[PDB]
RNA sequence: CAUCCGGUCGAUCCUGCCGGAGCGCGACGCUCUCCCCAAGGACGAAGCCAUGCAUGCCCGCUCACCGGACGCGGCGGAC
RNA sequence: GUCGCGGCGCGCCGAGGGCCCGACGCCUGGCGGAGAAUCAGGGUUCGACUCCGGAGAGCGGGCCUGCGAGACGGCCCGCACAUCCAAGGACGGCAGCAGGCGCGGAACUUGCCCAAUGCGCGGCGCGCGAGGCAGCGACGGGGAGCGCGCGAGCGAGGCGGGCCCACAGCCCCCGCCGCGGAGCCGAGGGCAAGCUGGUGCCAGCAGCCGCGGUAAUUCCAGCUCGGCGAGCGUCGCGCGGCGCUGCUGCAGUUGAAACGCCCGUAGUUGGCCCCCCGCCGCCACGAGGAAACGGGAGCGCUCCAGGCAGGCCCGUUGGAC
């Protein structure tokens, strides 16, 4: 019978764009979300560039 | 000598008791309601 | 009168207790420690063993068996209760043994028997003296 | 560690320390009987929450008259149990809480109040139209059989204004 | 939320122990429709370790490549 | 010498200090506290683990950097293990999160994310196996249900849409079709609950008394019946039972128990009396000092186990004590 909720009215586009939860934003229809990349690739990555010296750009 | 020498009827197929609360419900008039004592074994002979 | 009742006459009472406690049997069996490393068992619940050997006013004879604890290395005899069990436990079969009713103490006429068979080759006996598992693996 | 450590918990109920005793037995299935009772730990749950009422009763009154956490607690438990019912308005000593029992608590339960406005053929026939959701307490609906009632809702208690 | 019961005798009253009856903590056996909360390799092995992860960030220093690299420096890593 | 006092170290001098109000020594399957279990009152047992404090990172030692470490996801050595080698050399410390071996009666995914609470750096952010979410999960706790009635209704379950979510679930709301399922113990007494067939002191039951040597009211089966109930039973431990450890509150002629008798130190206990002063104990009040837990005021998470919310015109809304 009874549905409750919250609001949130912005002067302008500009200042939701600023304040804004990022998620918040996807779910509105206000960006498009590109396809996330798993954290665990990245800590790989992160460790074997680590491993390397001076230039490691190569991987 | 041989153990469990010492160690057949068809099951007598009849309907569930009414599970639930009812079985409550059926021991209320089992006693109360309708006739006892119990334990004899004429009684069993009224019943068969 | 008979016991001490001073003021100032605490620390009496204390050691007179302290020193009296110890004539119970059972505070002395609990708190000693000499059951808990006389006992094969060194507290546990009930045990994991090793068979190695069948036998058996009332003058009815009751089936037991001589076992071998994994973690302790000394002997003792456990009874199987349950009718027709005798043929379910073989010859160095993993067995596991737990306690009757009364701790320590011998239990009903059988002299000289202090535990159970509860579980053979991992299957519990009343699961299977009532058909419900079947020891097909052993 | 995790947040979920700090959620309280405890139990609700008793058991007596004499099970067989032939005249309880018989006592508790009268009450089950002229209340249409589930199991048995709802009585055990009435007899908990009386022990508590009893237990707080006694103290306050151990306490002189003018002691102020005497007149603080007292006025506390009688404002809780006439806001419930259990206790008649009339009475407003302490006194009386002692001479409560259980079938008091009963009396006030969401199968009682709808039984005795006549809404209802029996007990089990109010306890399951309660489960198929064909009352609204209040304004709101309610599918809790032991729900309590307190003394301002209970001229409230009415049919579901969705059910068919 | 102040409770007891059976067992020494041909029968009886006591002392005295044995056993039963409840709660909690764990282990074992059987069984299991729905929802909510929720502990989880501590129990004389502080025994032994493949595999993967658990501490980075940036204000200064750009003739580096087409400013992002990298490195010097600063803070932190003793929470 | 140390940040610094000090036998902390050295030199000299003197002799001293502790002890039945229990030193010293040995043992401990010994981290402590706030607390937990039990239940008339007085108490007994436990206290790995949530918060505070202490100690350690295979054993024993040493050191640099730094305000701060005798630090080990920092280095050096010895010892015990271990690994790679193109045999000359090199390298390691999961009592961090998952995972594996062994052990035992005994204990889970080699998952996703920093959106929330905070930490470090830094301006419009990054990172965090802290922390959160999900997976397994009958340690366990709370709420419903296997029908009511002479016919209607309603669950669980599936299909789709919402809402929620870092993404997904899940609860809940909405339309369509609609799986109704109880076991574990026992029937001589304690202890609520009785009919035939077998076997024959055999097989077996039995916490205790006991049954079974031809009606077995106790074993093995059927019927019947009782208890609790999505739970039931078995094993070990603690509390209670226990006024069988007795301060409250045991007994001591004969049941177990007054030293053979006297003296006597520590120790314990000590008649009556002073009207107001000081000191000790004692009682009451007060300050000061952490929360959680516990008690407890108020608030209808649909109730509840819980949480500190929440309504509109709120004590300054509240979270007192
Ligand atoms: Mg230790
Ligand atoms: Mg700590
Ligand atoms: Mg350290
Ligand atoms: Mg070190
Ligand atoms: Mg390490
Ligand atoms: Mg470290
Ligand atoms: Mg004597």
């Given at each position: 019978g009874h549905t409750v909720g919250f609001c949130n009215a912005y002067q302008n586009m500009d200042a939701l764009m600023k304040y804004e939860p990022g998620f918040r934003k996807i779910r509105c229809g206000l960006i498009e979300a590109p396809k996330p990349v798993s954290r665990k690739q990245l800590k790989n990555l992160k460790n074997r560039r680590l491993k390397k010296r001076g230039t490691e750009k190569a991987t | 000598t041989s153990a469990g020498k010492v160690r057949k009827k068809e099951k007598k197929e009849k309907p569930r008791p009414p599970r639930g609360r009812a079985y409550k419900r059926l021991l209320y008039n089992k006693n109360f309601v309708d006739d006892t004592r119990l334990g004899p074994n004429n009684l069993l002979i009224r019943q068969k | 009168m008979s016991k001490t009742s001073g003021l100032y006459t605490a620390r009496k009472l204390r050691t007179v207790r302290r020193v009296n406690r110890w004539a119970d049997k059972k505070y002395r069996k609990a708190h000693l420690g000499t059951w808990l490393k006389a006992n094969?068992?060194?507290?546990?619940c009930m045990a994991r063993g090793i068979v190695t050997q069948k036998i058996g006013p009332n003058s009815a004879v009751r089936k037991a068996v001589r076992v071998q604890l994994t973690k302790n290395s000394k002997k003792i005899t456990a009874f199987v209760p349950r009718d027709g069990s005798i043929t379910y436990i073989d010859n160095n079969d993993e067995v596991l043994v737990a306690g009757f009713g009364r701790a320590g103490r011998a239990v009903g006429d059988i002299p000289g028997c202090r535990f159970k068979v509860i579980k053979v080759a991992g299957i519990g006996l009343l699961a299977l003296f009532l058909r419900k598992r079947e020891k097909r693996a052993r | 560690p995790r947040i979920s450590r700090h959620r309280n918990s405890s139990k609700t109920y008793s058991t007596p320390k004499?099970?067989?005793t032939k005249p309880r037995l018989d006592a508790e299935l009268k009450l089950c009987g002229e209340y249409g009772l589930k199991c048995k730990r709802e009585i055990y749950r009435a007899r908990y929450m009386l022990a508590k009422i009893r237990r707080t009763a006694r103290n306050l009154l151990?306490?002189?008259?003018?002691?102020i956490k005497r007149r603080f607690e007292g006025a506390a438990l009688l404002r809780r149990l006439h806001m419930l019912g259990i206790?008649?308005?009339?009475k407003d000593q302490l006194?009386?809480?002692?001479?409560?029992?259980i079938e008091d608590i009963f009396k006030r339960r969401l199968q009682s109040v709808i039984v005795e406005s006549k809404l209802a053929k029996s007990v089990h026939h109010a306890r399951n139209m309660i489960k198929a959701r064909h009352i609204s307490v209040g304004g709101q609906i309610v599918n809790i059989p032991s729900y309590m009632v307190r003394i301002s809702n209970t001229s409230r208690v009415a049919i579901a204004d969705t059910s068919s």
């Open positions: - | - | 094969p068992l060194e507290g546990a | 004499k099970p067989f151990t306490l002189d008259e003018n002691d206790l008649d308005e009339e006194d009386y809480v002692l001479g409560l029992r």
